[PDB]
Design a protein around this ligand. Structure first.
Ligand SMILES: Cc1cc2nc3c(=O)[nH]c(=O)nc-3n(C[C@H](O)[C@H](O)[C@H](O)COP(=O)(O)OP(=O)(O)OC[C@H]3O[C@@H](n4cnc5c(N)ncnc54)[C@H](O)[C@@H]3O)c2cc1C
Ligand SMILES: Cc1cc2nc3c(=O)[nH]c(=O)nc-3n(C[C@H](O)[C@H](O)[C@H](O)COP(=O)(O)OP(=O)(O)OC[C@H]3O[C@@H](n4cnc5c(N)ncnc54)[C@H](O)[C@@H]3O)c2cc1C
Ligand SMILES: Cc1cc2nc3c(=O)[nH]c(=O)nc-3n(C[C@H](O)[C@H](O)[C@H](O)COP(=O)(O)OP(=O)(O)OC[C@H]3O[C@@H](n4cnc5c(N)ncnc54)[C@H](O)[C@@H]3O)c2cc1C
Lengths: 550, 550, 550
C-alpha cells in the first residue's frame, strides 16, 4: 500500500513503499496494514490511542504488520535495520489508559505479535508453569486449562480484565490478585528477538536441550527448552531478564510464567470501611498482616466511586457536571451497602488454615468502628465481590471495564504512583491526588493494590474524549500529579506514552545517572535505533531529545 | 610499594609504581597492599585462592586496595581507567570453594570494599528492610539487631556460615534457609559505582529524596534514599538490577535487603531417610509440599557424609584413603542416628498453623519405611539439627566449616548444578555425580537445597590442597561433571574462578547468543575493560579469548 | 611548587609539576601560586569562595597564576591545552555573593588577570569612552580621571562597591546606577584570547588600524585600534560579543566602555514609602516614569533592612536570633527616618529640565500617603542617600559593604530574579521570597533595581559562614527560591557557582534547546574544554553531567 498519513522520521515515500512491498512479500497482504477508529476493548485498535488524551492521531502507526512466526519478526527487524524504520511491538494492544497499541514515535510500524503468534506452547503440571506466545490472552489461557481439565490442578493469576496478553502484561510488570500476583516475578525463561535480529533465550533457556533424533534440524525458535528453563530463572552469569521489561531492548517472542497449584481451598471476602478517613487505620492494619502472610494474595482497597462506576455511569447517580461531594459519596456508599473504602481479599488452602487466618483478619479489622464483613453469597448478584471472587481465583471477567464509562465518552488515563504500606503515607498520597483532581473538575476514582512492602496506587482519571477543554485539564492534572508526587518522594511504576519522558525525568538522582546508563545500553544493542525509540523515555542517539521528548 | 610478583596485562613497572603512589595518596599507606599465605576463614586472605585447586599463586593480586568510602572507589576507578588497570572488587572475600578473594585476572588490584565500608546503614522496622555496605557480614548484622533489641521484631536469613557479607552473598545470588532464603530476590535499591566511575542507584533509589535543609550539600553517596527505595525494587523503565549480579557490570557499594518479621512461632525439624534410594520418593514427596507452602523455608536434603564431616574428619571414621563404601556409609549413619539422606526444615507462625502443616508433612513422609522424626531437643548436643535450628531462624554459626576438614589439608571446590524437584531427576543427577567422584577417588559429599520449582545441588568436593595428584583429579572431575551435566540438560548456577569459562560455554543455545549479548553490554559500559574482566566468562574486548579463557 | 590539595580532573601529580614548572619559567615564581584564608574585600582571596555557602574548600584552585601580559595568557592557554588543564579566569575576583574568585571545577588554575594586566589603556574625550584591562577597578579608573582632571568632562558608572573590575563586572552583565547603568550595553570593542589561544577583537576592533611607521612591528595585543572600534559595537557580520558575557567562550583581555559626559547638572534624592504594601503603588508609579525618561538612571527601591544593615549589624537593633517582626521593621524605619521601602534616584542636566522632571516625579509619588522627599543635605551625615549621591554620579564608595556584616560571620549569597515593572508582579515576587526566607530563619533583605522594562530583584541572603545548620538552610532556601520563581515565570539573571546548573536547568524551554545550542558552540571552540568548564552550567563534552552538575 502506497501512501500513509504519517511517515517515520527521515524516510522517503519511495523507501516506505519499497519496505512495505518487502514485508508484504514476507507475511502476505492479509497481515500488513497501511494507514492512509477507536474501536473497542472487544477488537482493539492497533493504529492509535483509543483513550486519547492528546489528539486522536497524535500517536499513530504508518502501518500495522502481523508476523506469522519468529522468522518473520527476524526478517522484519532485518528490513527495519536496512531502512532505519522504527518498530512498535505490541502483544494484544489493549494497554488502555497507557496508550493502547499506539507507537511512541508516529510513523512507526506497529508489530502485531498477537494475531498469528498465539499459541499456548506448554502447560507443565509437575513444574506448575506454562509457556506462552504474545497472542495468548488470559481468557485464552483459561479456556486452554478448561478444555484439558487443568483447572483442578493449576490456577491462573489475572489482572482486572481478561483480554490482556499474559506475556505483554508480565513484561510491563503488571499485577494480579492471587498469591502469584507479581506477574514479572512469576516468569522464568524468555525468548527475545534482539534489535540486531538474533534470537536470545534467557536464564536456563540458554542451556540448550541435549540433541535427540526427534528435535534435529529444528529452527532455533522451534527448539524445545532444557529441563530447568522455566523452573529457575537465573541461569548463570548476569541476570539480564529485567532489561527486557518496560524497555525497548528487544522483542519478546515467548515466556514461561509460573502457575499456582489449586490450593485445595478458597474463600474471597469484602471488608467495608465506613469513613473516608478509615483508609489510614485500615492500611496500618494491613501492614503487619501482609508481611506475615495472613494476607496471601494482592488484596485491594477500592474507593467507593470505583465500585459505583462498575455498577452504573455517573449520570445514574447524579446529574451534576462537577465532582460529587463528600455527602454524595456517603449516599452512594449507603445505596450500595459499601463503605467509603472497600477492602477485597481472599484466603487460600485448607479450611483449618483459612479459619485461623480469617479470625486474625476479622479481629484486627474490628478496631475500626462500623466495619462489616461479607462473603460473595452475602452480597447482591451484581456485586463487585462476586466479580472479584472469580478474579482472586484466576478466572477472567470483563465486568470492571464499565467504570471507564463513568463519563459520556469515557476514556481512561492511569496515574500510578507507589506508596508505603502505612496509613500516614496513604492518606498523604490520596490527599495530594484528590486535591488536584478537584482543581481539574474530575471525581477522584482509585484503587490501592497491596504489595508486600508497597502499594500500587491506581488513580483512574476518566474523561470525555470528545471534550477538548477537559482533555486539556487532564493533561494539566497528570503533569502536576507527576511533579507533586515526586516532590513527596513517590514515583510512578508505569505510564502512558505522553508521560514517559516526564516520569523518567523524575528518576533523576545523581543528575539522571539511571537514564544515561540506560541510554548507553540501548545504543550498544540497537545502533540503528529501530526498536520502540522513546519507550520509557529511553531514546537511541538518532532521536534528538529536543525534537522528541514530551 | 615497588615490585609486585605479577603485573596486570600490558602495564609497566613504572606505571604500576605511579598508580600505587597515586592510590596511597588517596587512601593512606595503611589501606593499600603490594604483593611482592592461605590464612583462615577467621581472617581471610585477599591475595589468592585459599582453597586452591590450581597452583596457589595461579590467581593472584598485584595489590590489595581498601577504599575508605565511595569517593575513594570513584577515584580508584578513575585511576584504573587512566592506566587501564583491572580491579577485582570483593566485599568480604570469603568466597571459599569459589575462589576466595582471588581475581580472575592475575595482577589485578583486589578492591577490599569491606574493611572500611562496613556500616549497617539502616534497619527500618515498619518497612522490614535493612540497608548495608559490603563490610556488613551476617554476624555483624546479627549483633546490630541484638544490640538494639530488634531480634523480637526482625529476623535475618543466613547461609551455612555467618562470616559472609550480606551484600556480597546476595549479588552472587546466594541462598539461605528461612522463607527469605532467595537472597537476590529479597533486595530492593542498590548503589553502584559504574566503570566510568559514576554513581548509580537502582529502582526507586533513582527517585531522589525531596530536598530538605538537613540533607543539603551531601555528597551523592551520602544522601538518603526516597521512601519507596527499599520497598519496591522495580522503579520505572528497564529493571537493570540483575545486570549487577554475577557480573562485572559495576561495583556495588550499598544494597537494601528485605527482612522477615519475627514470625510469632518457630520449630525446626529433621526427617531421617534410611536408604540411599529414598532420595527419589523424598523428592517426589517434597514437590507438592514445597509448591503449596507446607514447606515454608528452603529445606535441605543432606547426604550422610556432609553431617558426618561436620562431626569429625574422615580419619575419625575410617583409615582408608579410598572412598567409603556403601556399607561404611550405612554404619556411619547408624552410629550418628541419621539416615543415608537427612531432610532439614522448619515451621513458622502460630502453633495452630504449625500443627496443621507439621501433620501434613509427617504424614506425607510416613510413606517411606523407617522414617524417623526429631526436634532439636531429641538429638545430641553436637547435632547438626541443633546448628541448623539456629540457621533456619537467621542466627549465624560457624559449625559447618568443619566438613572442609574432611581430608588432611582440606580445601573445598563447589560443583553446583540445578535439578528439577523430582525423584527421577534427582537420582539421575546424583548417580552421574557419584560415579565421577568415584572414578576420581573422592567421597561423594553433597546437599540438595529446595527452591520452589528447582533444587540447588551443592556437591562439596573436598581435596587435600598439598596433594598434586589429587588437585589434578579434582580439576578432571569438575570439568567432566560440567560436561556430563550439560549433556543431561543441567547447568550450574554459580562457580569458581577456574571453571567460569567452561560453565558459560555450556549456556550456548543458538550459537552462544547469551554470551555475545552480554559482551556487547560489557564493552559499552566498560570501554577500558577495568572491572573484573572474565567474571562469569564475560571478557571485555581487550582480553583475547585465546589468551585468557580456561 | 610540588603538591596541591586538589588536582584538576585526570591530571597526574607529575604532569601538574611539569605544568607548574613550565608556567613559572614563563611568568616568574612571584606570579604563580600553588595551594598545598577568606581574606577580605580589601585583599580578596583567589583560591576559594570567601562567602562560602558550601564547605570552604569545596570550590578550590590547585594554583593561582598571574600573567604579566597577553603573550603570557596565550602561552598559558597553550600549556593548558597541551595538558588538558582547566583555567578559571578572574579580573579582580571580588564576585562576593557569587563565589568570589573560586573556580567551578576544583583543581583549576585561577588565572589572576588583574594583578599585572592593570592598565587604563585610553580615555578618549571626544568619543567619550575608556579602554581598560581586567585589573582596572572602578576606584582605579576614578583616580585616573581625577589625576588628569577628566572629572569635569566624563563620569563613570559604578555598582554599589568601588573595588570591582570595570571589565569583569561588564562581562557579567553587572548594573550600575547612572543613565549608563547597563554596563554590558555600554561596551564597544573587546579583545579576547580564544581557547585555541588565538587573539580576537570584536566589532570594529576587527577592522585594523591602517599601518603607519609608529605602530609597525607591534605584537597584535599591543597594536592600537581603528577609529570606530570603541564607538560602534556591531562591526560587520555576526555580532558575537554576547558570546563572551556570562560564558566560558574565551578570556577577555581588553574592553572599551562608553562613558557619560558630565551632564551639566545633577541632583540625587530619596523618596520614603511608609508601608510594606506601598511597593505595589510605587512600582506602578515607576513604570510610566521609567519608560518616558522622567527617571533617567537606574533608580533603586531598597527594603528598610538593606539601609539598616548598612548603618549597623543586627545585634545593634535587636538581640533576637529569629527574623525581625513586621512591627520591629516599622520601629527601625521610624528610628532611621526611612520608609519600609526607600526609593533612590537622581536627576541629570540643566536646572530647567531637572525642575520639570522633579515636579513630575514628586507629583506622581504624592498619590501614596505619607510619602516624604529628601535631598542629601536634608539627611544625617551617615545616611545611605549621601553614599548613593556619590554612587549616582559615578563616584566609588565602600560604605554598602557593611550590610554583609548583618550577622556575626556574615557572608552573602545573592538570589537575583527579574520582575516585571508592575506592582502586582513585584508584590508577588517579594511575597514568594519573603515567605521562604522566613521558613529558613532569615531576615528578608533586598533591593529592586529598575531597568527600563524590568527590575533586577537582588535578594541579599546573609548568613553566618561558621554556622553549619544555617549554611544548610541557605542552600535549601536558594534551591527552593529558584524553583518557586521559575514556577511563577521568573528566572535569575546571574548566580553563584553552586546554583549555576539548577539555574540553567530552569531555562529549559523546548527540552533545553538553549543549553544544547550553547554546548555545541562551546565544544567547537574549546575541543579540550580548558576554559572555565561549567561556567553558567555550560559543560564541555569531557565533563560528564552525572559527575559534575550540582
Ligand atoms: C479497566 C482496566 C483495568 C486494568 N486492570 C489492570 C490490572 O489489574 N493489572 C494490570 O497489570 N493492568 C491492568 N490494566 C492495564 C492494561 O489494560 C493491562 O495491563 C493489559 O494486560 C495490557 O495490554 P496487553 O497486555 O494486551 O498488551 P499490549 O498493548 O500488547 O502492551 C504490551 C506493551 O509492552 C511492550 N510489549 C508488549 N508485547 C511486547 C513484545 N512481544 N515484545 C516487546 N515489547 C512488548 C510494549 O511496550 C507494549 O506497548 C487495566 C486496563 C484497563 C483499561
Ligand atoms: C563451608 C561453606 C559453606 C557455604 N555455605 C553457603 C550457603 O549455604 N549458601 C551460600 O550462598 N553460600 C555458601 N557458601 C559460599 C560462600 O562462602 C558464601 O556464599 C559467602 O557468603 C560468599 O563470600 P563473601 O560473601 O564474603 O563474599 P565475597 O568473596 O566478597 O564475594 C563476592 C563475589 O561477588 C562479587 N562481589 C562481591 N562484592 C562485590 C561488590 N561490592 N561489587 C561488585 N561485585 C562484588 C565478586 O564477583 C566477588 O568475588 C559456603 C562456603 C563454604 C566454604
Ligand atoms: C555588597 C556587595 C554589593 C554588590 N553590588 C553590586 C551592584 O550594585 N551591581 C553589580 O553588578 N554587582 C554588585 N556586586 C556583585 C559583585 O561583587 C560585583 O559585580 C563585582 O564588580 C564583581 O567582581 P569583580 O568585578 O571583581 O570580578 P571578578 O570576580 O573578577 O569576576 C568576573 C567573573 O566574570 C568572568 N570573568 C572575569 N574576568 C574575566 C576575563 N578577563 N575573561 C573571561 N571571563 C572573565 C568569570 O566568570 C568571573 O568569575 C556586589 C557585591 C557585594 C558583595
Amino acid at each position: 500500500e502506497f501512501r500513509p498519513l504519517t511517515l517515520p522520521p527521515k524516510l522517503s515515500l519511495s523507501d516506505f513503499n519499497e519496505f512495505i512491498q518487502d514485508i508484504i512479500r514476507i507475511v502476505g497482504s492479509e497481515n500488513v496494514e497501511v494507514i492512509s477508529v477507536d474501536g473497542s476493548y472487544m477488537k482493539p485498535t492497533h493504529t492509535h490511542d483509543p483513550h486519547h488524551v492528546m489528539d486522536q492521531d497524535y500517536f499513530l502507526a504508518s502501518a500495522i504488520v502481523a508476523p506469522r512466526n519468529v522468522a518473520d519478526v527476524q526478517s522484519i527487524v532485518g528490513l527495519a535495520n536496512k531502512f532505519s524504520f522504527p518498530l512498535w511491538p505490541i502483544s494484544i494492544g489493549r494497554n488502555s489508559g497507557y496508550g493502547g497499541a499506539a507507537p511512541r514515535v508516529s510513523g512507526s510500524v506497529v508489530l502485531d505479535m498477537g494475531k498469528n503468534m498465539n499459541r499456548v506452547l506448554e502447560v507443565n503440571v509437575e513444574g506448575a508453569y506454562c509457556v506462552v506466545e504474545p497472542g495468548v490472552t488470559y481468557h485464552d489461557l483459561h479456556n486452554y486449562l478448561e478444555a484439558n481439565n487443568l483447572r483442578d490442578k493449576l490456577w491462573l493469576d489475572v489482572p482486572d480484565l481478561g483480554g490482556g496478553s499474559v506475556l505483554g502484561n508480565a513484561v510491563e510488570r503488571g499485577v494480579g490478585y492471587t498469591p502469584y500476583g507479581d506477574h514479572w516475578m512469576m516468569h522464568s525463561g524468555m525468548e527475545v528477538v534482539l534489535a540486531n535480529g538474533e534470537l536470545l533465550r534467557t536464564g536456563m533457556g540458554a542451556l540448550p536441550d541435549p540433541k535427540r533424533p526427534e528435535t534435529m534440524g529444528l529452527k532455533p525458535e522451534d527448539q524445545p527448552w532444557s529441563k530447568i528453563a522455566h523452573l529457575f530463572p537465573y541461569g548463570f552469569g548476569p541476570y539480564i531478564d529485567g532489561l527486557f521489561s518496560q524497555s525497548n531492548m528487544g522483542i519478546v517472542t515467548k515466556i514461561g510464567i509460573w502457575l499456582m497449584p489449586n490450593p485445595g481451598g478458597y474463600q474471597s471476602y469484602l471488608i467495608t470501611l465506613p469513613k473516608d478517613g478509615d483508609l489510614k487505620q485500615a492500611v496500618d492494619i494491613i501492614r503487619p498482616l501482609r508481611l506475615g502472610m495472613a494476607l496471601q494474595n494482592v488484596p485491594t482497597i477500592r474507593h467507593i466511586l470505583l465500585d459505583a462506576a462498575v455498577l452504573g455511569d455517573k449520570r445514574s447517580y447524579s446529574s451534576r457536571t462537577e465532582p460529587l461531594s463528600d455527602e454524595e459519596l456517603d449516599k452512594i456508599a449507603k445505596q450500595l451497602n459499601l463503605g467509603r473504602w472497600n477492602f477485597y481479599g481472599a484466603l487460600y488452602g485448607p479450611e483449618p488454615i483459612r479459619r485461623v487466618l480469617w479470625e486474625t483478619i476479622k479481629d484486627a479489622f474490628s478496631a475500626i468502628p462500623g466495619v462489616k464483613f461479607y462473603f460473595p453469597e452475602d452480597t447482591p448478584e451484581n456485586s463487585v465481590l462476586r466479580v472479584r471472587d472469580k478474579t482472586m481465583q484466576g478466572i477472567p471477567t470483563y465486568d470492571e471495564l464499565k467504570w471507564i464509562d463513568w463519563l459520556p465518552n469515557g476514556a481512561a488515563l492511569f496515574f500510578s504512583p507507589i506508596a508505603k504500606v502505612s496509613g500516614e503515607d496513604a492518606m498523604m498520597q490520596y490527599a495530594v491526588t484528590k486535591k488536584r483532581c478537584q482543581e481539574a473538575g474530575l471525581d477522584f476514582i482509585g484503587t490501592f493494590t497491596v504489595g508486600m512492602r508497597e502499594m500500587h496506587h491506581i488513580v483512574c482519571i476518566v474523561f470525555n474524549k470528545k471534550d477538548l477543554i477537559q482533555k486539556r485539564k487532564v493533561q494539566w492534572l497528570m503533569r502536576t500529579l507527576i511533579d507533586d508526587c515526586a516532590a513527596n518522594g513517590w514515583g510512578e511504576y508505569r505510564t502512558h506514552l505522553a508521560f514517559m519522558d516526564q516520569i523518567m525525568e523524575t528518576y533523576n538522582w545523581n543528575n539522571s545517572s539511571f537514564l544515561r546508563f540506560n541510554e548507553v545500553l540501548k545504543n550498544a544493542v540497537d545502533p540503528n535505533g529501530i526498536i520502540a525509540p522513546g519507550k520509557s523515555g529511553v531514546w537511541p542517539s538518532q532521536y534528538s531529545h529536543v525534537t522528541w521528548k514530551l
